[PDB]
């Protein structure tokens, strides 16, 4: 018998021929130079996730000199060759420490599971040995790396079991352990990140104990137990969500529960805050707390910190917030990428995290419903004029509030286009009186929408009108900020692409084998294959068509009417 598997050509045959052409006999290595070096350098400037051809790989193989010269030509040349036999691995690993140190941004490309090489992980760990504050923001992807950290772990597990066979029960991982033991806050972040991975991977549960053993100082462990009581607090919230009663009755019961919880908050000592690791919480105001009317039955409570100031917080249980949490972290990272351009889009980086497997917490904000703002306030103008009314003596213009509102609008549009976040509706969109445009429910993304697939821009008819009357100024300004954000993003987009590659490689909610096509789609919305920025202008033209249909065909007009009906 035989097996046909995955009237056609195949992959392994091309491997056969290509590998047959891989001789490279006379070992003398020339050091020639010519005008083609620039073109080759441009060929090495391609995106990390790309799959190079044959001739290009060989051209990069003879480029070893310049490949060592350019720091951006390192990872590309590393992926330009396949290491199986010790022959190639010899010169490879020999040139690993020989070549110039690569940029840490480009180091995230070779830090993925795509390259499992021991020397690669080693050298990368040596390059990642320096841990900045951005490593704490990279902890989200470090959890993905931790999920992908296991390859042929039977040997390591047996090695640990060898030393665990004595007393009864009662690698970059060492670098992560040292970084965890170094700063208590980073350790708390690692533990909190392990709390989520504990559900998916059973090994993470014991890895948390290994992390507790990784940190010698027990000073952080006490506050970690005080923060471990938050699990019992979430269990109490779930206990409050166990019984079914009237809306007002459940509200008063939530008040009594808030008092009983206020007793414990004063009883127990101060702990680490969910919003920031630096800030410490003191107590919570019982009468200042609120309750969500949604189906998730979220809890909103204002807790007075050690800084003697009230802090509103909204938490939820019985669901996985990892989607919107990772999306929030991505929004914060992107916000940092924008701050690196010395320009602020005035986007509010809402804090979101997952406490338990079903449980999660988020920093509350002054958010109002879009439908509520439409019905009650009768337009966004009055609502924006509610907090800080501005009537100019000339044009009746509005200040940095409206400016930040517009910047937040354009920024949210660019984010919605790029990331392709779906399930965004009038309900999923909120308005922040601080002058910010809030967006929630990131669970569906990467080209996944509840209804039929719409355009990239999330801009509705209302904002299109508000910016439509002001278009002569506001649309040109929003387009300027658009293009600027496009250049800024697409400039550094590589690192985010690699990070997203590793993160998606680990695992994802709402996406599974999406991942390949998802990476692809990210590249397409990014249009990395095009050196022309006219795509943004086309999107602007689409935004221009959002107000009025071009009516090229009857089905086109029906399509515009469909998009209008969907909103």
């Amino acid at each position, epitope marked *: 018998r035989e097996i046909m598997n995955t009237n056609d050509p195949i992959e392994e045959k091309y491997r056969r021929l290509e590998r047959a052409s891989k001789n490279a006999n006379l070992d003398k290595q020339v050091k020639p130079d010519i005008k083609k070096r620039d073109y080759l350098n441009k060929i090495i400037n391609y995106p990390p996730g790309t799959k190079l051809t044959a001739h290009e790989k060989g051209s990069i193989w003879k480029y070893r000199y310049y490949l060592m010269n350019n720091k951006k030509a390192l990872t590309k040349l590393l992926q330009s060759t396949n290491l199986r036999e010790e022959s190639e691995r010899v010169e490879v690993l020999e040139l690993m420490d020989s070549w*110039a140190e690569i940029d840490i941004d480009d180091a995230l490309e070779l830090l993925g599971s795509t390259f499992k090489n021991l020397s690669v992980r080693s050298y990368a760990v040596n390059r990642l040995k320096k841990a900045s504050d*951005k490593e704490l923001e990279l902890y989200l992807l470090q959890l993905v790396e931790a999920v992908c950290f296991e390859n042929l772990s039977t040997f390591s597990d047996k090695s640990n079991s060898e030393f665990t066979i004595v007393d009864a029960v009662s690698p970059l991982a060492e670098f992560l352990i040292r970084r965890a033991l170094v700063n208590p806050r980073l350790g708390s972040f690692f533990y909190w990140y392990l709390k989520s991975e504990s559900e998916d991977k059973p090994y993470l549960d014991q890895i948390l104990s290994s992390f507790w053993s990784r940190l010698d100082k027990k000073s952080r462990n006490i506050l970690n137990d005080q923060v471990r009581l938050i699990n019992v607090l979430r269990e109490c919230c779930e206990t409050i969500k166990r019984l079914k009663d009237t809306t007002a009755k459940k509200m008063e019961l939530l008040v009594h529960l808030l008092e009983t919880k206020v007793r414990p908050l004063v009883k127990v000592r101060p702990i680490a805050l969910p919003l920031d690791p630096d800030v410490l919480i003191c107590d919570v105001c019982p009468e200042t707390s609120k309750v969500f009317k949604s189906s998730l039955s979220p809890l909103k409570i204002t807790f007075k910190t050690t800084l003697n100031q009230p802090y509103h917080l909204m938490f939820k249980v019985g669901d996985d917030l990892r989607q919107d949490q990772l999306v929030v972290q991505i929004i914060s990272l992107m916000n940092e990428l924008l701050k*690196n351009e010395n320009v602020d889009l005035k986007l509010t980086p809402y804090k979101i995290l997952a406490t338990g497997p079903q449980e999660g917490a988020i920093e509350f904000i002054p958010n109002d419903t879009l439908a509520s703002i439409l019905s009650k306030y009768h337009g966004i103008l009055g609502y924006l004029k509610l907090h800080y009314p501005d009537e100019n003596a000339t044009l009746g213009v509005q200040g940095w509030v409206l400016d930040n509102f517009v910047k937040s609008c354009a920024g949210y549009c660019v984010i919605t286009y790029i990331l392709g976040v779906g399930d965004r509706h009038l309900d999923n969109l909120l308005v922040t009186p601080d002058g910010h445009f809030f967006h929630a429910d990131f669970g569906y993304i990467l080209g996944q929408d509840p209804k039929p697939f719409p355009p990239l821009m999330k801009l509705p008819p209302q904002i299109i009108e508000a910016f439509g009357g002001a278009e002569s100024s506001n649309y040109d300004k929003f387009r300027s900020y658009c293009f600027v954000a496009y250049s800024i993003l697409r400039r550094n987009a590589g690192l985010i692409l690699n990070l997203f590659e590793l993160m998606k490689t680990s695992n994802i909610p709402d996406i599974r084998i999406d991942p390949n096509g998802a990476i692809l789609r990210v590249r397409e919305r990014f249009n990395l294959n095009m050196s022309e920025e006219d795509a943004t202008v086309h999107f602007q033209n689409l935004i221009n068509d959002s107000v009025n249909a071009l009516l090229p065909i009857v089905i086109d007009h029906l399509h515009n009417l469909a998009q209008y009906w969907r909103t």
Partner: nanobody, 113 residues
Framework: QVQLQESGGGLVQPGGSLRLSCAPS???????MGWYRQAPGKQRELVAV???????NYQDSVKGRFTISRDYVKNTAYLQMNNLKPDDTAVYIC?????????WGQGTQVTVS
């Protein structure tokens, strides 16, 4: 580029020791981070430059005096100097090049009697 906070402002006698520090806020993993000094009615020149490779370079006059080590813990740059002189009293600033885009956080006044 990124937004950084660095204050070297102060006054001291000649031969003293004044420590300078720069704490960046923004995207990390900068291509290079360095510090320089300049006076009014004059031009600014390269003083201390610390690359991302761990290598550092200093000027001719401040050689052996002004040295800059990069602390990777908080991702903060530390420039320590000694034996300041009369002509060494001026306004100092710290610049950090990131991905080809230069970033100047701030500057401060240094006075020497």
């Amino acid at each position: 580029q990124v937004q950084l906070q660095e204050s070297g402002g102060g006054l001291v006698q000649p031969g003293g020791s004044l420590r300078l520090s720069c704490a960046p806020s923004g995207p990390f993993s900068p291509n290079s981070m360095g510090w320089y000094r300049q006076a009014p009615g004059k031009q600014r020149e390269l003083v201390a430059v610390m690359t991302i490779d761990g290598r550092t370079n200093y000027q001719d006059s401040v050689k052996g005096r002004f040295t800059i080590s990069r602390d990777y813990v908080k991702n903060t740059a530390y420039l320590q100097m000694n034996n300041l002189k009369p002509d060494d009293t001026a306004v100092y600033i710290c610049n950090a090049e990131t991905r080809g885009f230069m970033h100047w956080g701030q500057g401060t006044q240094v006075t020497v009697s």
